[PDB]
């Protein structure tokens, strides 16, 4: 689609370019960080739940504090530059300085001397210390995705966009995110399949990493250039933007509740409680399967080039399925089949594509022999099923799960509406991710490996989807009742 007028073009094209560059970098780094962490020497998918908690969220709080104290000393555009340019500096220094020195910075000797002491479940924790530059890459990719996408760009947009433009501009950005998924997938596939220079002695992944980070640097430079252009040619034009507009809404400056003044609001009434249960269950269910799926990827694609090429193809097909969804099942299913079915499609889809995946992962030897008669191994079949599950979730999230969340936010009174919305999006925004990481950390420490914890992940996934299904079924009763009295 292209639902933007002709006069708003000069304002939206720099915005669309900024969003395209930011999402392109986000996808490239999201795939490259998994490639680096999972394919590292002495590392694997077990390092992912340890990073995502013991490095991502403390660095997240550190960066949020630095940003909050920096916004008061720098101007808005100077703040954007001072936050975005360190990212580009790191992504230019990584493949040129930090990755070539990865056999000098990484303390492999101390790392294995430590691993010989810690329990075998802390292999994912000693893989952080063994690959601490790859861990810094993971942290900074997560911080790109958080800061430069959700905080920086979206604050810029919500500040400079008009309310009468916001819906169309955000729909255009939603379709541009899928177009950038397509582009970043093709670019990662190309940079990975560029396993050229047959003359050995060079790192085949070194060239791919140089190409990926070079595309990232060019995209970040185009981002900075479009930001400068929209500041010097648009945000100073009294026709597109005027700071006399958002002051009305900023009179009541955003009162972000800390954690627990909302943890009690999640206990005020069963409505917001069940909605928080839905969000938390989604956040945990999406994370529970990803670590096992990435272990299966490390098994199927040992070297970093094939892993990154699969991640590129996976991003490309996530983009394809996202475009198909946004074009066909955009707002169809919710209004066609009620709120309960729209809220239940995602849990039952995760349930089906997760029990199949965990059956292929647990019953490998039982399946290898029946699947072998179909040309594939249960490892490749589990990889495919996990990729299908991830694609379906990341595709019909924005159209099936978020669309039912916000639809449930409707029949509430404005006070409880905004307060409970803030409560959910302040606690369960990570609570789910951090909990899905902590569950996997505990299961790795207790069980001892990823292959040994997968029978317990399936039981936990069934115990959470059961909560997800029962809470969505109960929330549908309080959603249908309150909607009827709101009519009169």
């Amino acid at each position: 689609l292209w639902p933007i007028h002709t006069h708003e073009l000069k304002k939206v094209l720099p915005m669309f370019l900024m969003f395209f560059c930011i999402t392109f970098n986000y996808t490239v780094l999201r795939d490259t960080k998994d490639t680096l962490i999972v394919g590292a020497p002495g590392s694997g998918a077990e390092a992912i739940p340890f990073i995502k908690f013991w490095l991502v969220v403390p660095c997240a709080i550190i960066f949020m504090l630095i940003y909050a104290k920096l916004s008061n000393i720098l101007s808005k555009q100077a703040l954007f530059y001072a936050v975005g340019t360190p990212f580009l500096i790191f992504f230019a220094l990584f493949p040129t300085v930090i990755y070539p020195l990865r056999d000098v910075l990484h303390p492999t000797e101390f790392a294995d001397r430590l691993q010989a002491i810690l329990p075998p479940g802390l292999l994912g924790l000693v893989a952080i210390l063994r690959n601490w530059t790859f861990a810094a890459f993971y942290v900074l990719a997560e911080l790109w995705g958080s800061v430069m996408l959700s905080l920086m760009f979206w604050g810029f947009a919500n500040e400079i966009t008009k309310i009468h433009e916001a819906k169309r501009f955000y729909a255009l950005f939603g379709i541009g995110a899928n177009i950038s998924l397509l582009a970043s997938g093709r670019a990662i596939v190309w940079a990975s399949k560029l396993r050229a220079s047959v003359s050995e002695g060079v790192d085949p992944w070194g060239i791919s990493l140089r190409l990926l980070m070079a595309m990232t640097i060019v995209s970040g430079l185009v981002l900075m250039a479009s930001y400068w252009w929209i500041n010097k040619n648009v945000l100073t034009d009294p026709r597109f933007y005027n700071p006399e507009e958002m002051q009305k809404g900023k009179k009541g400056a955003k009162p972000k509740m800390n954690m627990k003044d909302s943890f009690l609001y999640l206990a005020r009434s069963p409505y917001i409680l069940l909605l928080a249960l839905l969000v938390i269950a989604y956040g945990i269910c999406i994370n529970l399967i990803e670590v096992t799926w990435k272990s299966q990827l490390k098994l199927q694609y040992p070297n970093m080039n094939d892993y990154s090429e699969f991640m590129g193809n996976f991003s490309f097909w996530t983009g394809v399925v996202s475009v198909l969804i946004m074009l066909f099942v955009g707002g169809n299913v919710i209004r066609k089949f009620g709120w309960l079915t729209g809220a239940l499609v995602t849990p039952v889809m995760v349930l089906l594509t997760g029990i199949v995946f965990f059956a292929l992962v647990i019953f490998r030897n039982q399946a290898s022999g029946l699947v072998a008669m179909f040309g594939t191994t249960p490892l490749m079949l589990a990889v495919v099923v996990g990729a299908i599950q991830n694609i379906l979730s990341k595709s019909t999230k924005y159209a099936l799960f978020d669309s039912t969340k916000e639809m449930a936010y409707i029949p509430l009174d404005q006070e409880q509406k905004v307060k409970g919305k803030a409560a959910i999006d302040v606690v369960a925004a990570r609570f789910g991710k951090s909990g899905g990481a902590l569950i996997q950390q505990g299961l790795l420490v207790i069980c001892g490996s990823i292959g040994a914890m997968t029978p317990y992940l399936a039981v936990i996934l069934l115990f959470i989807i059961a909560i997800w299904l029962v809470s969505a079924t109960k929330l549908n009763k309080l959603f249908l009742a309150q909607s009827a009295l709101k009519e009169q």
Partner: nanobody
Amino acid sequence: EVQLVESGGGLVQAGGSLRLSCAASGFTFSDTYMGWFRQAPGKEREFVATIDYSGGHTLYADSVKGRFTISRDNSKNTVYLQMNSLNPEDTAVYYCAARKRYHYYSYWGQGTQVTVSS
């Protein structure tokens, strides 16, 4: 009806070679997915190799990859399995399996026993 029968089992030595046969009958051989399995006494039946429909796609077990090669002949109805560099771990009764083009269960032969330098 779906009679499968194996041939070529026996013994050579630890590191020898053998060529199994699957001279089947009773179905459209050009439209069936064949393959070879084995079941040592006390172990579970594992697969050795499968041949797609014409020889394009072959899937070997990671324990026999490179050593064994599976080949069919849609004209001369028979599935072959050329076994080379036989290890003492290879001793078992080798079954030939056959799945139709759209079915989901594989018919099994009586199986031929292969032993190598006990």
